[PDB]
C-alpha cells in the first residue's frame, strides 16, 4: 500500500481503539486522551518520513500508487511540493490542538477525541487527493463534524455559531460544485493530469471563475462575508478554533493553486482587479473593526481576516514571489493564530471565564511567562522581522504591487494597522495599569502544559523566520508551474 | 480497493454498529462467532459482486464498440 | 553543542566524496523513473475514460 | 569547463524546451517538455545571480573607481534582468506561435 | 408468485380469527416475497427495450425486472417491522450457537416484548401490503391504458385501506378519509387523460400512441395536439399521487395522522412505481425535431412541479415542529430533484434519475426505522414534560415532536449518529451517498442547459438544510428530558429467566433487570446495513452505478 | 467546564457585553443607515476598483533605465 | 429591427397577469368563512387583483419599451421590465426598503432566467453532433497566439515575441518620445 494512505488510516485506527478499549475494562478518560495523542504523534512521524523522501524538483506526483482498477469515484493520493507543507502543518498542529485542550473538555471526552481524529483524516485528505471532485468531497466532509464540535463543546452562543459556519460553508461550496461539474463534463474527468492539459475557452473560464471565486470569497473569508467566522472561530472550543483557523482557512489558499491558476489563467488575469479591490477593502475594513472589538477571542478571529486578504492578493499576482509568499504567510498564520487562540480562548478564558477586554489589565505583574509568549505572538501577528509572518507579508505584498501597484500600496497599509491592533490588545491585557481590580484572587502563571505548546508554536515561527529556505526549496520548482506568461526573447525557442 | 476485502470488513463493521445501537458489549467470548458469520456473508456478497462486475464490463465494452460502429457506419454513408 | 557536533559530522568533505550515511540516503529515495512510469500509466487510463464517458453519454437517441 | 556533476545527470532534460511536434496525449513527453522549459528559465535567472555576485566583488574591489571598472558586468547583469524571469510553461503549452 | 402468495395467504387468514397468528403470517409474507425475488432475478438474461406479454397488455424490460426486485426487497424490510417483536432480552449466558440453537430461555415475555401490541394483532396487514405491491409491480409493466388504470387503482385502493386499518384511532381513520377523497379526485384526472387518448387515437396500446407521436414529429387536417394535452391531465393525477407541489397539501396531514409503522410503507412504495412508469412515457414522447409539438410538451408540468416542489418543500419545512410533518415535507423537496432529472431527458439525467430513486428509497427507509426504534427504546424511560402528556395516539406514533428527541445522544449515541448520517445524506453533504445523487442530477441539468433550475436547487438545498440541522441540534446540543425508569433498576426488582435444555431440564436460572432488555436484532442490523451503505458508498460504487449506465444504454440504444 | 478563579463580575459591564452580542437584532433601515451602508459597501470599493481597472499594466519598473519610459501603455 | 407598440403589449401583460390574479381573488371569496357575497371579489379582494394588474402591466410595457429604446433584443430587457415590476410590487406595501428589495429580487431573477436560456419551455437545441462538440473542446489544447491576445491583450507579463519593438511604436505614437535606453557600460 502507498505511504500516503498510512497518513489516512492511522487516525482511523485511533478512532477504533478509543471505541474498543472500554470493552476490555469503566475505563479512565486519561487513557482515552493518551491514545488519541499518541496516534497524532505517529501521523507526524510518518509525515516527516514522507518529507525526507520527497524530491524538491520533480514535476511528477510522488508517493502515488498505480490503481489501474477504474471506477466512478476512486481515491488518488499524490504529494507535490506545492501541497507537502500544508500536510506537514496539519500534522504538527493537531497534537498541539489536543494538548491545548487537555483539561478543558471535561465531558463527552470520547466524542471530542473521535471528532478531532476524524477531522485530521479529512483535512489530510484534502491536500493529498489528485482530483478536483475528490478535492470538493473532502473540502466539505469536514462540515458535519464541525457542526457537532461547536454545539457539543462550544460556548454560550454555540448554536447560532454552528448554524452560521455550516450554512455559509454549505452555500458557498455549492457554487464551486457547479463549476467543478462543468469542468468534468467538458473534459470527462477531474484527475489533475488531464485537466492541466486542457485549456477552456475564455467565456467558459470567465464563468468557471464565477463559481470558484464565490466559494473562496465565502471561505477566505472577505469582509462582506465573514460573519460566520466571527461566530464560529469564537464560540468553538479551543481545539476547534485551532483547526478552524490554522488548517480549515487554508483549504481555499491551496485550492487556488489547483482550481484557478493552472486551468483558468485568462480569467484570473483579466479579473484580478476585482479580486484586488475586494482584498484591499478587507485589509482596511477588517483592520478598522479589529481596533474596536471588546471580545479578546473575537479580536484574534478578526485578525485572521486581514491576514487572509494579503495571501489572497499574493496568489493572484502571477509572480513567483507573491505565490511563495502566500504559502509562507499561510503557514505563518497557522502557527501564530494558533498561539493567540491559545492565549485568548485557552488561558484567560480558563482563568477568568470571560473574554471581555474590560476585565483585564496588567497581567505582566502576576504572569510574566504568559506575557513573554503573548508579546512574541503579538509581534508576529504584527508582521515583525525574524518571524515567518514577516517574510510571508513581504513577498505577498511585493507581488501584489508588481501586478497592480495601487492595490499593493493600500494592502501595505496592513503594515501600519496590523501593528496598531496587535500592540493595543497586548498593551491593554499585559500592560496598561496594574493587575486589574476585577480579579478578586490571584491567577497562577502558565502551567507546564501551557508553556510547552506556546513554546513549541513560537519556536516554529522564529526558526522558520530566520531560515525560510526550509520551506522555500520545495516550493520553487512546483510553484514555477502555476505562473502564466512569456517574455519576448525567452519564449518559443528553436 | 479489493471487493472481497471491503465486503468482508463491511460485515465486520455491521456487527460493531449493531452492538453499538443495541448498546450490548462488543467482544463477549460466547458471542464472538457472530464476527466470522458477518464477515463470511461479507465475503460471499462480493464474490457475487465480482461476477456482477465481470459481466457489466463485457456489456459496457460491447456497447462502446457498437457506438463506434454507428458513428463509423454513418460517416461511411455520408462520404457520398 | 549538539548542533555544532552534528553539523561538523555531516559535512561532505574537501571535494565530493560523500559520507556513507549520505550514500545511504540518496540510495533509498532514488525513484529514478518510478514516479514517472506510474503516473504515465494512470494518465493514459484516465484520458481513456474521459473519452469513453463522452462516447456513452453523447450517444444518438 | 567545470565537470558535470553526477547529480547533474538524473535531472538533465533530454528534450528541447518546446511544444512543437509534441503529442499531448503522450504524458511522459509532455511532462518532459514542461520540465525542459522550467529548467532553461531557471538557469537563465541563476546566470544573473552569479554575474551579480561578481559585480558585488568588483564594486567592493574598486570602490570609487567602480563607475569605470565594472561596466561589462553591469551590461551582462542588466541584459539578464530584462531577458530572464521565471514565467512558467502554461502560456507556451496552450498557445502555438511561429516566426511567420 | 405474488398472486399465488395472496390467494394462499387469503385462504389461511379466511379460516382463522386468531390474532396471535399475525406475526407468523407476516413472516410467510417475507418468505413469499423471497420466492418472487428468485423468479424475477432469473428473468434477467436478455437485452430488449421491451417484450409485450399476455396479448400486449403487459411488457417486460430489464429496467422493469430490476425495479420489480427492488420493490420486493424494500417490501421485505418494512415487513420485518411486523414479523419480529420490538425488544428482546439477551444475556451472555445464552449467546452461543449451542444455546441459540439447542437450549431455550423461558421468562414472562408479554410486557417486555409487547406481545399484544396493536401492530402485532391485525391479521390482514401482511395481505394488504401484498395487494399494494401487486398494483405497483403491475404499473411498472403496463403496456395499455386500461392496464395502467386498473393497476393504479389496485395500488391506490390498497394504500387507503392501509391508512384506515388502525380502526380504533380517530387520527388514522381521518387520514384514510383525506387520502381516499383526495385520491379519488386524482384518479378522475388519470381516467380523463386516458379516455381522451383513446377517443382521439382509436387505440389503448402505448406503442401505437408512441408511433402516432413518432410520425407526427417531423419539422394538416389532423394535428396531434391531444397527445400533449392528454398527457398533461394524465400527469396531474400522478403528480398528486407522488405529492409534488402544487398538489402536496395532503401528504403532511396523512403521513402524520396514520401510525408510523404504516407511514414507512405508504410514503415509499407509491413513488417507486409511479416514477419508473413515467420515465418510459417521457422517453417515447420526446420531440427530437424542434417543431410546434415540443412547445406544448407535457414535460413542462414536471419542470414547474419540480421548481415548485423545491421551493415549497424546503421553505415550509422550516417552521414544522412535528417530525412526521417534517419528513413529509422533506420528501417533497426530494421529488423536486427526481422530477428535474425526469424532465431533462438525456442519457446522464436518466442514469441520475435511476440512482436518486433507489438511494432515496433506501435512505428514507432508514429515517423511518430509526424513528420507530427510538419510540420502542423509551419503554425503559419516563418523562415529566407537560407537553408530551397531551399527545394523541401515543402508541401509534410514539415519537411525534422533534422536542421528544432532545438529548437522544445521551440515551443512545450510535442510534443518534445513524440518524445524523441519514439526515446529512438528505442535506447532500459528501462523502455521504445523497451527495452523489444530487451531484449527478445537477451535472445532468447543467450539461443540457438547466443552469437556471440548478441555481434554484442549490439555493433551496441551503434552505432545506436549515430544518435538517434543527433535528441534529435537538438530538445532540441538549440534555434529555427523558430519565431512566426508577423501578426498572430498583435492586429488589428482577425478573427470573430460566435456561433449559433440549429435553426441557433446567440448565440455569438467572436474575435480570431492565438493563438486560435491548432492541431486537432485525431492527438493529437493518439500521446498521443502511447507515454503512450511506457512509461507505465511495468505496463500493462500481456495481450500483454501472447497472444504471447499462440500463439507460438500452433504453436509449439504437 | 473547569471552575475559574473569582471575578468581581461588573453588572454594568456584563450588560454592556450582552448589549453588543445582541446588537444586530435591533438594526433598522433608516435614511442614516442606508447612507453609511451605501458609501462603505458600494462607493469606496467601486472607487478602488475603478483605479485598479484604469492603472492595470500601466507601469513597469523592471529593468527600465534612463531613456526608457516607466509607462507600458 | 421591427419596432413594437409598447402600450399595446403592456396591456396584454396586465390582462394576462391580472387575469390570473382575478382567479386568485375568486379562491379567496370561495374560501371566505362568512357570508361575504359574490361582489366581495371586487371589494374585499380587489386589491389582490389590482396588484397583479399593476405588476403585469409594468413588466411587459417597461420591457417592451426598453426593447425599443436600446434597439436590441436580448436578456437585458427582461431585466429592465423585472426591476420596474418589483418596483411596483413594493409600492403597495408603502415601505421604501421593500421597493428596492423587491425590485432587486425580482429583476435579478428575470435577467437570470433569460440569460441562462429559456428553461421552463423547450431548451434550445443546437442540432449538432454532441460527441464532436465535446471531443473538440477536450482536445483543443493549444490555440493560435493571436486568439488569446485578443481577450487578455499583450502586457501584464504577457510579452509576446516583438513586444519591445511594438511598445516602441505605441509609446512614440502616444507620448511622442523616441526610446533610446542608456548603454550603461563605458566601453562599446
Ligand atoms: C449491501 C448490503 C451488503 C451486506 C453484506 C453483509 C453484511 C452483514 C450481514 C450479516 C447478516 C447476518 C444475518 C444473521 C444474523 O443476524 O446473525 C446473528 C444472529 C442473531 O444473533 P444476535 O444478533 O446476537 O441476537 C441474539 C438473539 O438471537 C436474539 O435475536 P432476536 O431474537 O432479536 O432476532 C434474531 C434474528 C431473527 O431472525 C432470524 O431468526 C433469522 C432467520 C433466518 C432465516 O435476527 C436476525 O437474524 C436479523 C437478521 C437481519 C438481516 C437482514 C437485515 C436487512 O445469530 C443467530 O443466532 C442466527 C442464526 C445464524 C444465521 C442464520 C441465518 C443467516 C442468513 C440470514 C438472512 C436474513
Ligand atoms: C444498503 C441497503 C441494503 C438493504 C438490504 C438489502 C441489501 C441488498 C440490496 C440489493 C442487492 C441485490 C439483490 C438482488 C437479489 C439477490 C441476488 C443475489 O445476491 O444473488 C442472486 C442469487 C441467484 O441464485 P440462482 O441459483 O438463481 O443463480 C443461478 C445462476 N448461477 C448458478 C450461475 C449463479 O440468489 C437468489 O437465489 C436470488 C433470491 C435470493 C432470495 C432473496 C434475497 C433478497 C435480497
Ligand atoms: C544565541 C546566538 C548564538 C548561538 C550559537 C551560535 C554558534 C553555534 C552554531 C550552531 C550550529 C553549527 C554551525 O553551523 O556553526 C557554524 C559556525 C561554527 O562552525 P564552523 O565549523 O566554523 O562552520 C564553518 C565551517 N568550518 O558558527 C557560526 O557560523 C555562528 C554564526 C552565529 C551568527 C552570526 C551573526 C548572524 C546574526 C547577527
Ligand atoms: C456524519 C455524522 C456526523 C460526523 C461527526 C460524528 C461525531 C461522532 C461523535 C462520537 C460518537 C459518539 O460518542 C459517544 O458519546 C457518548 C455520549 O453519551 C458516550 O457515551 C458515554 O458517555 C459518558 C462518557 O463518560 C458515559 O458516562 C455514559 O454512560 C455513556 O453514554 C460514548 O462513549 C461515545 O462514544
Ligand atoms: C449496494 C449496491 C451493490 C450493487 C447492487 C446492484 C448489483 C446488481 C446489478 C446487476 C445488473 C447489471 O448487471 C448485468 O445487467 C444485465 C442487463 O440487466 C444482465 O445481464 C444478463 O443479460 C445478458 C444478455 O442476454 C445475459 O447474457 C447475461 O448472462 C445476463 O446476466 C444482468 O442483470 C447482469 O449481468
Ligand atoms: C454568478 C453566479 C455563478 C454562476 C455560475 C456558476 C457556475 C457556472 C459554470 C459555468 O457555466 C456553465 O457553462 C457551461 C459551458 O459554457 C454550460 O454547459 C453548456 O453545455 C452545453 C454543451 O453542448 C452547451 O451547449 C450549453 O450552452 C450549456 O448547457 C453550463 O450550462 C453552464 O452552467
Ligand atoms: C512603487 C510602484 C511604482 C510604479 C507605479 C507608479 C509609477 C509612476 C510612473 C510615472 C512616470 C511614468 O512615465 C511618465 O509618464 C508621465 C505621464 O504624465 C510623464 O509626465 C509628464 O507628462 C507630460 C507630457 O505628457 C509632461 O508635460 C509633464 O511635465 C509630466 O506630468 C513623464 O514624462 C513620464 O516619464
Ligand atoms: C446569477 C446568474 C448569472 C448567469 C449564471 C450563468 C449563466 C450561464 O448561461 C450561459 O449561457 C451561455 C449561452 O448558452 C453559455 O455561454 C457560452 O456558451 C458556449 C459554450 O456553451 C460558449 O461557446 C459561448 O461563447 C458562450 O455564449 C453558457 O451556457 C453560460 O455562460
Amino acid at each position: 500500500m502507498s505511504l500516503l494512505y498510512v497518513l489516512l488510516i492511522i487516525p482511523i485506527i485511533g478512532i477504533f481503539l478509543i471505541s474498543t478499549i472500554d470493552s476490555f475494562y469503566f475505563f479512565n478518560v486519561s487513557y482515552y486522551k493518551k491514545i488519541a495523542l499518541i496516534t497524532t504523534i505517529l501521523n507526524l512521524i510518518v509525515s516527516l518520513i514522507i518529507y525526507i523522501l520527497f524530491d524538491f524538483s520533480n514535476n511528477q506526483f510522488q508517493f502515488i500508487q498505480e490503481n489501474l482498477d477504474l471506477s466512478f469515484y476512486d481515491i488518488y493520493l499524490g504529494v507535490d511540493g506545492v501541497s507537502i507543507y500544508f500536510v506537514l502543518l496539519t500534522t504538527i498542529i493537531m497534537p498541539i490542538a489536543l494538548v491545548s485542550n487537555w483539561n478543558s473538555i471535561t465531558n463527552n471526552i470520547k466524542s471530542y477525541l473521535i471528532i478531532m481524529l476524524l477531522l485530521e483524516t479529512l483535512l489530510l485528505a484534502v491536500f493529498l487527493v489528485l482530483d478536483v471532485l475528490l478535492f470538493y468531497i473532502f473540502f466539505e466532509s469536514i462540515l458535519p463534524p464541525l457542526f457537532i464540535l461547536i454545539g457539543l463543546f462550544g460556548s454560550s452562543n454555540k448554536v447560532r455559531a454552528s448554524f452560521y459556519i455550516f450554512l455559509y460553508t454549505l452555500l458557498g461550496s455549492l457554487f464551486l460544485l457547479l463549476s467543478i461539474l462543468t469542468m468534468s463534463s467538458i473534459v470527462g474527468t477531474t484527475y489533475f493530469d488531464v485537466l492541466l492539459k486542457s485549456s477552456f475557452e475564455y467565456t467558459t473560464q470567465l464563468f468557471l471563475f464565477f463559481g470558484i471565486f464565490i466559494a473562496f470569497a465565502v471561505k477566505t473569508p472577505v469582509w462582506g462575508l465573514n460573519s460566520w467566522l466571527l461566530r464560529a472561530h469564537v464560540e468553538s472550543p479551543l481545539g476547534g478554533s485551532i483547526v478552524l483557523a490554522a488548517i480549515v482557512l487554508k483549504l481555499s489558499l491551496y485550492g487556488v493553486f489547483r482550481l484557478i491558476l493552472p486551468i483558468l489563467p485568462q480569467a484570473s488575469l483579466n479579473l484580478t482587479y476585482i479580486v484586488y479591490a475586494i482584498g484591499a477593502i478587507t485589509v482596511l475594513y477588517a483592520s478598522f473593526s479589529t481596533l474596536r472589538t471588546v471580545d479578546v477571542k473575537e479580536l484574534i478571529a478578526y485578525s485572521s481576516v486581514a491576514h487572509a486578504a494579503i495571501y489572497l492578493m499574493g496568489v493572484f499576482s502571477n509572480t513567483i514571489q507573491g505565490l511563495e509568499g502566500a504559502i509562507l504567510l499561510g503557514l505563518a498564520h497557522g502557527f501564530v493564530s494558533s498561539g493567540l487562540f491559545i492565549c485568548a480562548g485557552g488561558i484567560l478564558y480558563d482563568r477568568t471565564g470571560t473574554r471581555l477586554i474590560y476585565f483585564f489589565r496588567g497581567l505582566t505583574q502576576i504572569m510574566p511567562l504568559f506575557s513573554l509568549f503573548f508579546f512574541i505572538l503579538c509581534l508576529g501577528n504584527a508582521g515583525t522581522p525574524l518571524t515567518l509572518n514577516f517574510v510571508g507579508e513581504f513577498m505577498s505584498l511585493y507581488g501584489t504591487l508588481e501586478r497592480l501597484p495601487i492595490a499593493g500600496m493600500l494592502a501595505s497599509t496592513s503594515i501600519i494597522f496590523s501593528a496598531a491592533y496587535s500592540i493595543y490588545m497586548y498593551n491593554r491585557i499585559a500592560f496598561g495599569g496594574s493587575v486589574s481590580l476585577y480579579f478578586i484572587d490571584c491567577f497562577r502563571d502558565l502551567t507546564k502544559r501551557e508553556f510547552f505548546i506556546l513554546f513549541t508554536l513560537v519556536s516554529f515561527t522564529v526558526i522558520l523566520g530566520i531560515y525560510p529556505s526550509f520551506v522555500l526549496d520545495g516550493l520553487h520548482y512546483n510553484i514555477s508551474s502555476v505562473v502564466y506568461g512569456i517574455e519576448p526573447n525567452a519564449s518559443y525557442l528553436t | 480497493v479489493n471487493r472481497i476485502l471491503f465486503w468482508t470488513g463491511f460485515g465486520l463493521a455491521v456487527r460493531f454498529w449493531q452492538l453499538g445501537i443495541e448498546m450490548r458489549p462488543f467482544f463477549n467470548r460466547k458471542s464472538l462467532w457472530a464476527y466470522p458469520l458477518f464477515g463470511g456473508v461479507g465475503a460471499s456478497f462480493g464474490y457475487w459482486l465480482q461476477s456482477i462486475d465481470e459481466k457489466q464490463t463485457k456489456m459496457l465494452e460491447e456497447r462502446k464498440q457498437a457506438i463506434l460502429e454507428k458513428r463509423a457506419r454513418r460517416a461511411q454513408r455520408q462520404a457520398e | 553543542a549538539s548542533s555544532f557536533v552534528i553539523y561538523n559530522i555531516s559535512r561532505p568533505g574537501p571535494n565530493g566524496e560523500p559520507s556513507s550515511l549520505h550514500k545511504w540516503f540518496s540510495k533509498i529515495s532514488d525513484y529514478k523513473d518510478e514516479w514517472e512510469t506510474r503516473n504515465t500509466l494512470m494518465a493514459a487510463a484516465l484520458e481513456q475514460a474521459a473519452h469513453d464517458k463522452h462516447l456513452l453519454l453523447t450517444a444518438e437517441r | 569547463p567545470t565537470p558535470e556533476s553526477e547529480a547533474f545527470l538524473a535531472k538533465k532534460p533530454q528534450v528541447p524546451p518546446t511544444f512543437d511536434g509534441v503529442d499531448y496525449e503522450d504524458n511522459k513527453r509532455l511532462k518532459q517538455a514542461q520540465d525542459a522549459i522550467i529548467r532553461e528559465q531557471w538557469v537563465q535567472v541563476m546566470m544573473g545571480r552569479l554575474v551579480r555576485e561578481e559585480l558585488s566583488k568588483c564594486y567592493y574591489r574598486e570602490g570609487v573607481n567602480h563607475l569605470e571598472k565594472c561596466g561589462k558586468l553591469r551590461e551582462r547583469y542588466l541584459q539578464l534582468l530584462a531577458n530572464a524571469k521565471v514565467k512558467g510553461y502554461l502560456f507556451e503549452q496552450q498557445n502555438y506561435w511561429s516566426k511567420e | 408468485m405474488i398472486m399465488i402468495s395472496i390467494l394462499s395467504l387469503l385462504l389461511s387468514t379466511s379460516v382463522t380469527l386468531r390474532r396471535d397468528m399475525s406475526i407468523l403470517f407476516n413472516r410467510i409474507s417475507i418468505i413469499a416475497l423471497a420466492y418472487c425475488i428468485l423468479h424475477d432475478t432469473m428473468s434477467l438474461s436478455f437485452i430488449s427495450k421491451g417484450i409485450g406479454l399476455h396479448g400486449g397488455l403487459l411488457h417486460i424490460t430489464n429496467l422493469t425486472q430490476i425495479f420489480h426486485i427492488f420493490i420486493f426487497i424494500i417490501s421485505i424490510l418494512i415487513l420485518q417491522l411486523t414479523s419480529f417483536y420490538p425488544r428482546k432480552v439477551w444475556i451472555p449466558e445464552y449467546s452461543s450457537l449451542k444455546d441459540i440453537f439447542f437450549n431455550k430461555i423461558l421468562y414472562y415475555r408479554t410486557k417486555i416484548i409487547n406481545k399484544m401490541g396493536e401492530h402485532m394483532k391485525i391479521i390482514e396487514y401482511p395481505l394488504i401490503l401484498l395487494f399494494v405491491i401487486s398494483g405497483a409491480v403491475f404499473l411498472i409493466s403496463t403496456n395499455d391504458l386500461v392496464s395502467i388504470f386498473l393497476s393504479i387503482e389496485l395500488q391506490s385502493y390498497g394504500l387507503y385501506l392501509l391508512s384506515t386499518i388502525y380502526r380504533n384511532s380517530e387520527l388514522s381513520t381521518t387520514g384514510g378519509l383525506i387520502y381516499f377523497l383526495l385520491g379519488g379526485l386524482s384518479s378522475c384526472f388519470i381516467l380523463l387523460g386516458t379516455s381522451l387518448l383513446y377517443v382521439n387515437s382509436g387505440t389503448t396500446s402505448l406503442d401505437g400512441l408512441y408511433i402516432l407521436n413518432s410520425i407526427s414529429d417531423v419539422n394538416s387536417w389532423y394535428k396531434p395536439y391531444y397527445l400533449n394535452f392528454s398527457l398533461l391531465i394524465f400527469s396531474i393525477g400522478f403528480l398528486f399521487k407522488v405529492s409534488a407541489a402544487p398538489f402536496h397539501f395532503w401528504s403532511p396531514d396523512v403521513y402524520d395522522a396514520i401510525p408510523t409503522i404504516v407511514t414507512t410503507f405508504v410514503a415509499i412504495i407509491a413513488k417507486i412505481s409511479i416514477f419508473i412508469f413515467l420515465l418510459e412515457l417521457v422517453y417515447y414522447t420526446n420531440s427530437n425535431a424542434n417543431s410546434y409539438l415540443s412547445e406544448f410538451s407535457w414535460t413542462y408540468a414536471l419542470l414547474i412541479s419540480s421548481l415548485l416542489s423545491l421551493i415549497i418543500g424546503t421553505v415550509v419545512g422550516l417552521t414544522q415542529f412535528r417530525i412526521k410533518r417534517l419528513l413529509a415535507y422533506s420528501t417533497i423537496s426530494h421529488v423536486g430533484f427526481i422530477l428535474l432529472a425526469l424532465s431533462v431527458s438525456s442519457i446522464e439525467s436518466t442514469q441520475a434519475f435511476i440512482f436518486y430513486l433507489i438511494q432515496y428509497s433506501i435512505s428514507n427507509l432508514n429515517a423511518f426505522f430509526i424513528l420507530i426504534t427510538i419510540g420502542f427504546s423509551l419503554y425503559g424511560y419516563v418523562t415529566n414534560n407537560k407537553e408530551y402528556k397531551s399527545l394523541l395516539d401515543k402508541n401509534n406514533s410514539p415519537i411525534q415532536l422533534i422536542s421528544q428527541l432532545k438529548g437522544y445522544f445521551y440515551i443512545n449515541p450510535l442510534l443518534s449518529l445513524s440518524l445524523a448520517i441519514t439526515i446529512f445524506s438528505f442535506v447532500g453533504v459528501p462523502p455521504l451517498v445523497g451527495f452523489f445523487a444530487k451531484q449527478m442530477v445537477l451535472s445532468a441539468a447543467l450539461d443540457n442547459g438547466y443552469i437556471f433550475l440548478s441555481l434554484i436547487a442549490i439555493i433551496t438545498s441551503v434552505i432545506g438544510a436549515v430544518y435538517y440541522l434543527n433535528v441534529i441540534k435537538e438530538i445532540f446540543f441538549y440534555s434529555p428530558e427523558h430519565e431512566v425508569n426508577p423501578v426498572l433498576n430498583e435492586s429488589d426488582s428482577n425478573f427470573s429467566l430460566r435456561i433449559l435444555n433440549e429435553k426441557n431440564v433446567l440448565i440455569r436460572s438467572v436474575l435480570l433487570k431492565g438493563r438486560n432488555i435491548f432492541i431486537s436484532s432485525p431492527f438493529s442490523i437493518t439500521i446498521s446495513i443502511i447507515t454503512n451503505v450511506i457512509l461507505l458508498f465511495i468505496f463500493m460504487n462500481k456495481e450500483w452505478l454501472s447497472m444504471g449506465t447499462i440500463l439507460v444504454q438500452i433504453l436509449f440504444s439504437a | 467546564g473547569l471552575q475559574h478563579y473569582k471575578i468581581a463580575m461588573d453588572p454594568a459591564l456584563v450588560r454592556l457585553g450582552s448589549m453588543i452580542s445582541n446588537r444586530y437584532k435591533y438594526f433598522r433601515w433608516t435614511k442614516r443607515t442606508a447612507l453609511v451602508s451605501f458609501m462603505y459597501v458600494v462607493v469606496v470599493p467601486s472607487t478602488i476598483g475603478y483605479l485598479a481597472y484604469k492603472t492595470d499594466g500601466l507601469w513597469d519598473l523592471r529593468a527600465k533605465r534612463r531613456g526608457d519610459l516607466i509607462s507600458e501603455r | 429591427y421591427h419596432p413594437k407598440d409598447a402600450v399595446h403589449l403592456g396591456l396584454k401583460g396586465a390582462a394576462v397577469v391580472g387575469g390570473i390574479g382575478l382567479l386568485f381573488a375568486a379562491v379567496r371569496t370561495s374560501l371566505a368563512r362568512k357570508n361575504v357575497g359574490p361582489w366581495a371579489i371586487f371589494t374585499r379582494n380587489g386589491k389582490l387583483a389590482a396588484t397583479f394588474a399593476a405588476v403585469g402591466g409594468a413588466y411587459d410595457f417597461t420591457r417592451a419599451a426598453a426593447a425599443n429604446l436600446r434597439e436590441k433584443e436580448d436578456w437585458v430587457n427582461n431585466g429592465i421590465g423585472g426591476l420596474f415590476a418589483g418596483a411596483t410590487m413594493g409600492l403597495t406595501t408603502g415601505r421604501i426598503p421593500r421597493v428596492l428589495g423587491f425590485a432587486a429580487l425580482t429583476g435579478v431573477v428575470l435577467a437570470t432566467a433569460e440569460y441562462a436560456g429559456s428553461g421552463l419551455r423547450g431548451v434550445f437545441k443546437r442540432d449538432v453532433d454532441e460527441y464532436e462538440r465535446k471531443e473538440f473542446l477536450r482536445k483543443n489544447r493549444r490555440r493560435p497566439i493571436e486568439e488569446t491576445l485578443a481577450e487578455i491583450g499583450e502586457g501584464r507579463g504577457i510579452k509576446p515575441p516583438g513586444y519591445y519593438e511594438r511598445r516602441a511604436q505605441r509609446l512614440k505614437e502616444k507620448y511622442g518620445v523616441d526610446i533610446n535606453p542608456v548603454c550603461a557600460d563605458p566601453d562599446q
Side-chain angles (χ1 to χ4, degrees), chain E residues 131-430:
Chain E
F131 271 115
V132 182
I133 295 161
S134 77
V137 294
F138 266 95
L139 184 70
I140 296 317
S141 48
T142 43
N143 199 28
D144 198 280
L145 295 176
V146 188
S147 293
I148 294 163
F149 179 69
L150 282 162
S151 299
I152 205 49
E153 299 301 81
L154 190 45
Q155 195 191 201
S156 296
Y157 292 143
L159 285 176
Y160 308 150
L161 290 168
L162 283 188
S163 299
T164 311
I165 212 158
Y166 288 72
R167 54 183 307 266
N168 285 339
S169 308
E170 296 177 304
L171 292 186
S172 290
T173 55
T174 294
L177 179 77
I178 301 175
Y179 200 2
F180 174 90
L181 277 168
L182 290 179
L185 186 57
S186 178
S187 313
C188 276
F189 283 70
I190 289 187
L191 197 45
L192 177 66
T194 52
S195 78
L196 282 168
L197 274 163
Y198 159 80
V199 142
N200 282 295
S201 64
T203 183
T204 53
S205 67
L206 287 188
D207 254 352
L209 277 167
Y210 291 156
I211 289 173
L212 287 175
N213 159 73
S214 195
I215 298 159
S216 73
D217 191 14
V218 175
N219 44 1
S220 302
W221 276 83
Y222 290 92
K223 313 298 288 298
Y225 275 121
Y226 69 99
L227 182 83
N228 283 343
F229 187 104
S230 292
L231 295 166
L232 183 137
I233 304 163
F234 180 95
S235 81
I236 289 313
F238 281 105
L239 285 173
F240 170 94
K241 299 181 181 306
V242 295
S243 192
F247 326 95
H248 73 285
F249 299 89
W250 72 276
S251 265
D253 292 25
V254 169
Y255 294 164
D256 196 39
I258 63 172
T260 317
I261 301 298
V262 181
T263 187
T264 298
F265 188 79
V266 307
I268 290 162
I269 198 69
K271 296 169 187 66
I272 314 170
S273 78
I274 291 161
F275 276 134
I276 286 304
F277 157 82
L278 281 174
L279 184 80
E280 300 300 307
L281 194 63
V282 163
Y283 181 84
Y284 298 102
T285 54
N286 192 266
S287 296
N288 306 265
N290 274 41
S291 170
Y292 37 85
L293 279 298
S294 173
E295 287 176 334
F296 297 95
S297 185
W298 67 278
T299 61
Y300 301 157
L302 317 165
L303 262 188
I304 308 161
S305 278
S306 83
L307 172 141
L308 290 185
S309 301
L310 287 164
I311 296 156
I312 296 307
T314 70
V315 159
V316 190
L318 291 178
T319 44
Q320 307 298 285
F321 62 95
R322 292 178 83 65
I323 185 59
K324 292 169 73 178
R325 299 193 60 89
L326 183 63
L327 290 166
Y329 278 111
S330 163
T331 313
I332 295 163
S333 49
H334 288 285
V335 311
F337 271 99
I338 292 158
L339 270 176
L340 172 67
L342 185 66
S343 300
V344 182
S345 202
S346 62
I347 307 194
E348 186 177 15
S349 71
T350 318
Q351 290 162 187
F353 170 87
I354 296 307
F355 182 60
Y356 203 105
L357 190 73
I358 291 162
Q359 73 92 27
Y360 179 60
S361 311
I362 273 173
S363 314
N364 190 359
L365 161 59
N366 206 46
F368 275 108
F369 276 45
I370 294 161
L371 200 70
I372 292 171
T373 300
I374 290 181
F376 290 139
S377 82
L378 297 184
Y379 178 83
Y381 283 72
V382 285
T383 181
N384 296 114
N385 185 284
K386 185 260 289 181
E387 180 81 335
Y388 308 163
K389 316 190 145 83
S390 56
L391 292 188
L392 324 175
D393 289 14
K394 269 185 292 186
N395 277 4
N396 305 128
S397 313
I399 305 294
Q400 282 181 28
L401 301 174
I402 296 166
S403 73
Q404 310 180 227
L405 287 178
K406 204 180 196 68
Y408 201 81
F409 168 74
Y410 295 101
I411 302 171
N412 200 327
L414 264 84
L415 198 42
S416 305
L417 205 60
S418 306
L419 187 51
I421 285 150
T422 303
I423 279 178
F424 282 119
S425 185
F426 294 157
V427 177
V429 215

Side-chain angles (χ1 to χ4, degrees), chain A residues 46 50 191 235 237 269 289 310 343 355 407 432 446 485 487 490-491 494:
Chain A
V46 171
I50 291 162
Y191 184 72
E235 300 309 303
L269 193 58
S289 57
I310 303 296
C343 296
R355 273 131 180 176
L446 287 195
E487 301 314 284
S491 44
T494 56

Side-chain angles (χ1 to χ4, degrees), chain F residues 29-30 56-60 62-73, chain G residues 97 155-157 159 163 167 170-171 174-175 177 179-184:
Chain F
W29 280 120
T30 71
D56 220 358
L58 191 46
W59 302 294
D60 182 45
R62 182 48 65 101
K64 304 275 196 302
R65 287 189 300 264
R66 252 181 319 104
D68 204 8
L69 273 186
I70 302 179
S71 297
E72 255 191 345
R73 176 174 68 255
Chain G
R156 297 178 307 158
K159 295 160 68 181
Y163 173 82
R167 188 182 100 108
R170 194 165 68 261
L171 282 184
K174 171 184 180 60
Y175 291 111
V177 176
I179 290 186
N180 197 9
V182 291
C183 182

Side-chain angles (χ1 to χ4, degrees), chain D residues 17-37:
Chain D
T18 187
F19 287 104
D20 289 330
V22 176
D23 180 75
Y24 281 19
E25 294 183 355
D26 184 1
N27 314 102
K28 178 179 179 180
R29 185 60 197 89
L30 161 97
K31 293 282 286 173
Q32 285 188 346
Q34 294 161 347
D35 183 286
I37 296 89

Side-chain angles (χ1 to χ4, degrees), chain A residues 280-295:
Chain A
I281 300 299
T282 176
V283 168
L284 311 167
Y285 293 0
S287 294
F288 295 165
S289 57
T290 309
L291 293 174
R292 296 293 297 280
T293 314
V294 323
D295 191 302

